[PDB]
Structure 1
């Protein structure tokens, strides 16, 4: 035979007889030993597990419990992983003892007590270095969220110790945390049992608390007539508008007609369970009775009621609704305004999910004020901000209250000056970050300006966005591009992390950072952090979901030192167009998401172009007055926030690029209706403001793809159309109102949708760029009504900069500073997650 128990049994739990030791052919096995197990096809490598229990089964025979390790190559790291590094996972199962192939040694590599001083790995060590030739683990891994975290520290029961499986225990904790449950009973009525409290997903709900509910959870009293359908596309003069046919897509870039409704908000009146005919309550079916809260836009006053109202302003209602407890999307605080000790602004700024109501809403009296008697300091982290720009990321972190950016590195001098203007106590370095790091590593204390260099222990948080020029393609690395990456600013920034070993680390970038070079930039970044011993994760965030009227996805890498909690990604605050909120990432055929659970709705309504800039005075093309009058108070909640509490007599930087006479005429001929762009231009001559003329565009070749006009005219302008001929200059066709190059190459660029495009008041900005040009890719830069490009101030508003935030240089310098920044509201959301970790640190 081969397998024989060592000793007598220790417990007989039914059909199972547990043992403490077993003997397989020439080895002995005890609880706690590590083993390998062959897979079902010997092509796949060995599985590795820890033995947590051993028992004879009355029917199936000799058994053990395997708590599997995860091979590094099976994580997001893939083949960048240390070949002998394993990761802890909550994966386990009962297994026949006959599946064991060998006993294996696995070492736990704990970070030293002096970990923060052990940095100084060279880039080759960070990128490609491995540990000393044995199986080891340092970190636990979440396979769905791609999170590397310090190993959990669960403790066993006096009855668990002999068979304890930490994976089993943690999975039981998760299941119990996720199943909805009642806790305390309140009163026993004839048909149902009332409760004072319930819990769901770790959140405690009591009678009186506010709940978030899906928009589908209940309707309002409103009996309305159905609105009209989409704008009936009436025919147009195709000779006057030869490019209008290119708008057959019916889809409007930057439009909010597809954004979901925000949550329903209710106050728990009743938590109850149906009582069986037999007396006992059915506690698998928990129901909630709420009073409905009206948002302004839910009243007979439609959407326009939202224009001026506070974003968290509600009205009490006495309409009631019964929903399932499992429908609750979260807890929120809804409290009567004129009974809180603080003021409403301090309240709204002091915590998440805070709403207030001053009046009530009688629906079909359509009136206000209905029955009210029912309604009853850590120190900041010293922060180094690399590639800081003018300071949007540092500004959002400061607003979150977690950071003092004491050092910034910004190579472009106008942005460095702007950072200095907003951060007088900061030390701003303009030289190359490699130079600075090499100086520090050589033992220097000051740079060539006499500025004091940060040293180990000074830097507690490190953040930045490193440029990726040279390796921003999607195709795989070769030797040349990989050398560029090894000597890149990304790797320099990682070397900063390795040297200074801050408590928290943030790398922000364009969304496609997660896909560059077949995701190898991302995988190697994570590999470096793991090699340093950091907890770390990655994800994609949409800036609009955190309160700007702009679509701007960013890739985010977060890391936290051993001893810290690894931050979560922030839950979306505002609803936003779903097409702009694709946050998942596929790496090596594995789809990763973040912890974000608000996927289809959120607490606050979407922020619009109207919210963003309806208060700014009209200005002209080329507006250059640096200091003007606002001409009135803020109108929207967003404007109130960005203008701030203190009266501001002067509006700064509401200045616009001075476009040419031809470009100005084009802009003057873009209609104001939503979705308008160059394809709506007329094919006319126009006398320009400099006496010159704008010529009619007329065709030169037959586009077989697009065919001919409504009445025979060719829709082609170039020998290009032949698809096999070359460009002949005989149709260059300069100084045309309808630009020539857009029909020239439009068939391969989605009709150049959005160029010379107008913003719409109800919509959002396209990604705010460093130099707004109507004929650039992000060409939707025209004001909704004025015949001009958006101003520097309007771009700053689109990024969520306070109006008081100072910029520096000429108009193009200021546009670039604004367009390169992280939006402060996005940075603040991230920082508040970091603050949660600072407060939770054991």
Structure 2
């Protein structure tokens, strides 16, 4: 009934391998594909390739199954082609009696003319099927939701008869993870020294720099205990009646909980303890390092970090011993006064680069000079940027060195003009992107302005951020909203990708793009890319982790053409508040993360509001001078980067909105202490700059939930604070310094935390918005000390724009251009991941 076809081919102990087996009326050979029924009969069939066939002396006839992954089991879910399978690194030994039948599974490889095969309508992208047998084209990573071209892992001549691609790749991954020593240096009395060791694919040698977690070692600086902020001191509750609403100790935009960046050391020794027989215990690798000081680790403490370069260190003679498994990565730490090039071009020429010029003596608290023993392109992609705005994403890609944006599409004219001023060689289209694509597909060569349209082969990279108006809710699709989606700018952008078939594709959006419409927007987007034959992935990034003093999470979809390497997401560069770094995504109860491994720390300290704008001159509410003096040199590393190399005599766009007299009076009475907002306003009369008056807020109803003040005063300002009573229109009070509407509805809006809120010098910006309004949702827009809202220039700094980047229009147009942009430091980090793929292409 089940019988081997022939004789054995290898007797490996208790296993007898065969090349062919006959089951009932069928014959199976290595390489065939088969189905297996699960224990749950309602579940669909399991499908696998047979990689080996053998008899076991105890268990009987066996085979090795290299499982396929059904499309529904991927992030695509039910949007998947019902007959599409995906390769995965999942396999197991199995008895032959579990085999149900033989199946045909074909490999649908992209053609050599794949770049010219695009042009299918949205219905075919969204809902079209291959309409054939079972097939696969892509390999799938279930943890990271990555679709990639199938691996080309070659067999041996030894294991060809039983070769399993999944087994080989799993073995490669396991060995790549375990730390190993390579080249033995010297045999000591108690340890064996080594010249080099490897971990996670990285080579470590004596003298190399290593990243370590902050807990790896301490410094010999006997720290002093900072004066911990006491409990909220009692205030005069009649002068500040709304101060009680600050019972939460949480401060928006505060950096009190951001982790320390990495400890940094230079490898002095790589060693293993010796067993009694003299052999080294190579399963327990240790390293000895010299401790490097960051400026803030010295006695000068945190203020030493204000002016210092973010990659400046101080050599020291202190030493520590840590486990090799604790090393978080490799870095370069060089003596500055021996570099072939200047420090700035060194620091900008590669990742993980640090430098030192002096040494630090903790006992002496002095800075001597270091001892003697401390010393030893690609053509850019032609890019089309859709929904470009003023050009933040293009600017970051340009800094990464990967792109020339030769075409841009921007329908809002002030942003289009801004893009032109910064990109004089680019062609900027103002038409609706559907119109342009229709013209190109009709065979047109120029638009109605005479501008040459991009044709197939011109576009090598496509990037953009499409709005999602009409389907940015969380509720499920219905027939109405699904119609709006297939006619949406998201789908139009995907049609550009299908038509032009660039080498690389990038879609950026608000974080909730991954959750819109029960994640169907994300799932359909990935479905379209797979249907085109693209490798693709998705993830969420926090802009503050790449060098801005701003919390801004963005959803990122990356795609790479067949023949390309699919980029990884960039590792965080700066530590940031952990509350703002929630990057995981749940799709259909399956949790997805990106390849990012820096979860607890990072190489550089967090960028603060101080780093962002401490150098800008004081200006008034309503400041309108477009060109002023800086009044001094840049003070921080961040300011030195954004001001640039060439001296800039003129500071542009340090202008602020002209708030009304009442609002200006409110801002003038928000205290400067961190976390101050409308709840710290005094309840007083104040004469305004226009002769009018601001009135005392009167408490006219009893709020049983909130109680009464210490002097017995009420805390409700309307009858609606009762259970069922409605807002009595006579209870509305006007022109009060404490705005009436905030105590009115504060009980159900978390007390309107942050409204009329001041930024904190040591903290970060909330998400930079298109129109700073102190009483809007993102109300924390007051300057840390000046009685005004943040200026256009300050908002640009919070986005990481260079001071030379030109904006266009009135002040509200400039705020909108800044607030809508992708921060260039985030775009640059993504661009450098793309550059790695350009250089590694086979």
| Fold in common (TM above 0.5) | yes
| 8 Å contact from structure 1 (residues 622, 655) kept in 2 | yes
Once the two structures are TM-superposed, the CA of residue 704 in structure 1 deviates from its matched residue by: 2.0
CA displacement, residues 207-228 of structure 1 (integer Å, 9 cap, x when unaligned): 0000000000000001123222
Contact 1:655 1:792 in 2 (8 A): yes
Any idea what the Cα deviations from partners look like across 1:149-186, whole Å, max 9, x if unmatched?
A: 00000000101100000000000000000000001100
Deviations 1:791-826 (A, max 9, x none): 000000000000000000000000000000000000
SS of the residue 2:457 aligns to: coil
CA contact (8 A) 1:781 1:790 kept: yes
Give the SS at the match of 1:756. Answer: coil
SS of the residue aligned with 2:521? Answer: helix
How far is 1:723 from its partner?
Answer: 3.3
Measured after TM superposition, the shift of residue 726 of structure 1 is 2.2
What's the counterpart of residue 44 of structure 1? Answer: 43
C-alpha separation between the residues in 2 aligned to 1:372 and 1:322?
A: 21
By how many angstroms is 1:710 displaced? 2.2
Matched-pair contact (CA < 8 Å) for 1:294–1:317: yes
Residue deviations 1:64-94, cap 9 Å, x none? 0000000000000000000000000000000
For 1:226 and 1:61, the matched residues in 2 are separated by 70
Return the offset for 1:458.
Answer: 0.3
SS at match of 2:227: coil
CA separation in 2, counterparts of 1:364 and 1:428? 62
Whether the 8 Å CA contact 1:572–1:602 is kept in 2: the answer is yes
Write out per-residue CA displacement over residues 696-748 of structure 1, whole angstroms, 9 at most, x where no aligned residue: 11123222221222222221122222232322211121111111111111111
**1:656–1:792 contact (8 Å) kept in structure 2:** yes
CA RMSD of superposed structures (Å): 0.7
Work out the CA distance in 1 between the residues paired with 2:101 and 2:728. Answer: 74
Instruction: Answer whether contact 2:358 2:370 (CA < 8 A) is retained.
Output: no
The answer to whether the 8 A contact 1:111-1:562 is kept is yes
Partners of 2:231 and 2:654 in 1: CA distance: 37
SS in 2 for 1:216: coil
Q: Distance in 2 between matches of 1:725 and 1:91?
A: 63
The separation in 2 between residues aligned to 1:760 and 1:221, in whole angstroms, is 31
Displacement of 1:231 in angstroms is 3.2
Q: Give distance in 2, aligned partners of 1:431 and 1:412.
A: 9
Cα offset for 1:760?
A: 0.6
**2:36, 2:99 within 8 Å by CA — same for their partners in 1?**
yes
Distance between the aligned counterparts of 1:725 and 1:117, measured in 2?
Answer: 67
Distance 2:700 2:128 in 1: 62
Structure 1 residue 370: deviation in Å?
4.3
SS at match of 1:136: strand
Q: Does 470-479 or 739-748 show the bigger shift?
A: 739-748
Mean CA deviation greater in 242-251 or 197-206: 242-251
Which has the larger displacement, 187-196 or 709-718? Answer: 709-718
Aligned to 1:346, the other structure's residue is in SS state helix
1:355 aligns with 2:348: no
Task: Classify the secondary structure of the residue corresponding to 2:357.
Answer: strand
Deviation per CA, 1:765-788: give whole Å up to 9, x if none: 000000000011110000000000
- After the TM superposition, which of the residue ranges 708-717 and 546-555 deviates more from structure 2? 708-717
1:61, distance to aligned residue in structure 2 (A) = 0.3
Is the 8 Å Cα contact of residues 756 and 780 (structure 1) preserved in structure 2? Answer: yes
Q: Residues of 2 paired with 1:747 and 1:259: CA distance?
A: 30
- Distance, in Å, in 1 between the alignment partners of 2:484 and 2:717 is 42
Contact (CA 8 Å) 1:418, 1:808: kept in 2 or not? yes
Q: Residue 270 of structure 2: SS of its match in structure 1?
A: strand
Deviation at 1:285, TM superposition (A): 0.1
User: Are residue 411 (structure 1) and residue 411 (structure 2) matched?
Assistant: yes
- Are the counterparts in 1 of residues 697 and 737 from structure 2 also a CA contact under 8 Å? yes
1:245 corresponds to which residue? 244
Distance 1:684 1:372 in 2: 64
Give, in whole Å, the separation in 2 of the partners of 1:508 and 1:706.
Answer: 43
Secondary structure of 2:292's counterpart equals: strand
Residues 353-409 of structure 1: per-residue CA shift (max 9 Å, x gap): 000000100111111124421122000000000000000000000000000000000
1:269 CA displacement: 0.2
Between the aligned partners of 1:720 and 1:15, the Cα distance in structure 2 is: 82
Q: Which residue of 2 aligns with 1:784?
A: 784
Distance 1:364 1:575 in 2: 29
**Alpha-carbon distance, 1:43 to partner:** 1.7
Partner Cα separation in structure 2 for residue 350 and residue 723 of structure 1? 65
Q: Which moved more, 1:65-74 or 1:371-380?
A: 371-380
Whole-angstrom distance in 1 between the partners of 2:478 and 2:701: 43
Residue deviations 1:423-462 (CA, integer Å, cap 9, x gap): 0000000010000111111111000100000000000000
Q: Tell whether the 8 Å contact from 1:716 to 1:744 is kept in structure 2 after alignment.
A: yes
Q: What displacement does 1:295 show?
A: 0.2
For residues 711 and 119 of structure 1, the distance between their equivalents in structure 2, rounded to whole angstroms, comes to 75
| Per-residue deviation, 1:270 | 0.2
1:424 and 2:414 are equivalent in the alignment: no
Higher mean displacement: 222-231 or 794-803: 222-231
Q: Distance in 1 between matches of 2:402 and 2:499?
A: 22
Instruction: Indicate conservation of the 8 Å contact 2:357/2:370, yes or no.
Output: no
Query: Partners in 2 of 1:650 and 1:17 — Cα distance?
Result: 82
Task: Note the alpha carbon deviations across 1:318-372, whole angstroms, 9 max, x for none.
Answer: 1000000000000000000011111100000000000000010011111112442
Does 2:376 correspond to 1:393?
no
Give CA-to-partner distance per residue, 1:24-58, whole Å, 9 cap, x none: 11110000000010111112111100000000001
Please give the secondary structure, in 1, of the residue aligned with 2:640: helix
Q: Give distance in 2, aligned partners of 1:130 and 1:658.
A: 57
Structure 1 range deviating more: 691-700 or 828-837: 691-700
Cα deviation for residue 265 of structure 1 reads 0.1
Any stretches of 5+ residues in structure 2 without a counterpart? none
Q: Is the 8 A contact 2:145 2:592 kept in 1?
A: yes
Asked whether the equivalents of residues 34 and 49 of structure 1 are also in contact (C-alpha less than 8 Å), the reply is yes
SS at the partner of 2:373? coil
Whether the aligned pair in 2 keeps the contact of 1:672 and 1:785 (CA below 8 Å) is yes
For structure 1, the 5+ residue unaligned runs are none
Report the Cα distance in structure 2 between the residues aligned to 1:740 and 1:474, rounded to whole angstroms. 32
In 2, the alpha carbon distance for the partners of 1:345 and 1:14 equals: 63
Which position in structure 2 is the counterpart of 1:332?
331
> Per-residue deviation at 1:237?
1.4
Change in CA separation of 1:191 and 1:522 when aligned onto 2, cut-off 3 Å: same
* 1:651-800 superposed matches below 5 A: 651-800=651-800
Q: Distance in 2 between matches of 1:710 and 1:473?
A: 44
8 A Cα contact 1:362 1:370, kept in partner: no
Alpha-carbon distance between aligned partners in 2 of 1:161 and 1:30, rounded to the nearest angstrom: 13
Is the 1:697–1:737 contact (alpha carbons within 8 Å) kept by the matching residues of 2? yes
Cα deviation 1:611-639 (Å, max 9, x = unaligned)? 00000000000000000000000000000
How far apart, CA to CA, are the structure 2 residues paired with 1:232 and 1:454? 63
Deviates more, 1:147-156 or 1:691-700: 691-700
CA distance in structure 2 between the partners assigned to 1:41 and 1:429 by the alignment = 56
The Cα offsets for residues 494-526 of structure 1, whole Å up to 9 and x where unpaired, read as 000000000000000000000000000000000
Is the contact between residue 63 and residue 94 of structure 1 (CA under 8 Å) also seen in structure 2? yes
Given that 2:769 and 2:819 are in contact with CA atoms closer than 8 Å, whether structure 1 keeps it comes out as yes
Partners of 1:520 and 1:713 in 2: how far apart? 52
Aligned to 2:363, what secondary structure does the other structure show? coil
- Write out per-residue CA displacement over residues 511-544 of structure 1, whole angstroms, 9 at most, x where no aligned residue: 0000000000000000000000000000000000
Which range is displaced more, 549-558 or 712-721? 712-721
Deviation of 1:239 (Å):
1.4
